[PDB]
Amino acid sequence: AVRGSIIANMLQEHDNPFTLYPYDTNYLIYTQTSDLNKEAIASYDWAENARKDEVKFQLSLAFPLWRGILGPNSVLGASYTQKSWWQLSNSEESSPFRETNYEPQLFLGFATDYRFAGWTLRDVEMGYNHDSNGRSDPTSRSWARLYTRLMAENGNWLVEVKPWYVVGNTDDNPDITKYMGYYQLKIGYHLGDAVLSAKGQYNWNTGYGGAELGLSYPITKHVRLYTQVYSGYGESLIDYNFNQTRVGVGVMLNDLF
Template identity: 45%
Template sequence: MQPVTLSPWPPIRQIIFCLSPTIPPRRQGVTDYEDRDLDNIEVQFQLSVQVPVWRGFLGSASFMSVAYTNRSFWQAYNSDDSAPFRETNHEPELILTWLNDWSLFGWHNVANQIAFNHQSNGRSEPYSRSWNRIYANFIFERDNFSIGLKPWYRIPEAREDDDNPDIEHYLGHFELGGRYRDGDHSIAIMVRNNLRSDNRGAVELTWGFPLGKRVDGYIRYFNGYGESLIDYDESVQTLGFGFTLAQGF
């Protein structure tokens, strides 16, 4: 999966495709997979679209966007089980962005965001997973470096309707991302932590490099919780390589 970009102002339309073989978790915490022989190699496919719908809603430096991400985990080489899609996650968002130009200790706060985010796997009980969040995103740049701090608040649900009441114990309340870019190459890191005594979180490292005019390759390592919604409470380790295709129109 391509790391979330720290740039807050995409083209009018942006579509990103990701294809990445990975090593999925060997142990599954969901009963409908216990009797399946899952392959250690699977394909991740991601489609992301973000479209600004209202420019200048609170001044000339602001705009509102709607976004949607679909991420699928495909057992493409598992011919014994007819190559099923193990999990698909859906993530629609409404994002408010304000561009900025003030500085702090040499870092430029280029933009700030507030967003409503819904994430679910679109399945019925007992395999349904979903949650709603309101998050902020504070984006800073300095020379070739970018940093984004993304804290969130989970919108409470009635306990009898909550598919995953303890998801914050594993995904925490914030995400910290950083990126260094040197020409067409980039190195990115993402960190999550629950800041609890039973410490849990995740770290993601990605090296991006050019393959063509609109094609970038990447190598990605992920370790921790929240790789997919169905396994949010399982610690997984994945190593992947793949490519992204980006098209603005």
């Protein structure tokens, strides 16, 4: 229902309650990073043996809690996005997990149809976001945001802007805004079945930021081959103030569209 429209999709009712809805992309890639941040995870007794090659995966689902809460084509929904970095090959340390980032959202979303000279604004979503890595001190990190997510598409292009405003406790990382900025821009281009994507955040004041380019292509109707290159600050929470360049290759289910 409208290529890449999270909200329109959530409005589509499923006959099976266990058929969930995709929020963000879902994938699993084998990666190699330029620098593995041992400093921040020094507390760990495997830190020394930390390898730069990790299994990286992302899980992202949405659950409509209440359709039509604010008129038709509206929904009160939640989503769960998890990103994990895993020392799978690091057998010498019993394949530890370096970092996981738990990111649940609660939001009011609308499926819309506004014209922008070719573009159609399809999603307008507003909600609360919480992002933490479930760690005890000192490696603990977390922050909360109120955000708005906007998505417009024009032919082969998709654009999504997600500005936010920080709320709650930031003591695990009080300077996180320095590296993350105030929004996230996402762009997707459809070249036939090939999907090119870019996702980043950039504080125009401090010069810090991070980017993520991706290219995918269908292996089957449900699964795709996915190549990713991340470069910059803020890849994960434990590396929010750490800079690295990371390349990975793996499988993917849904891309942004």
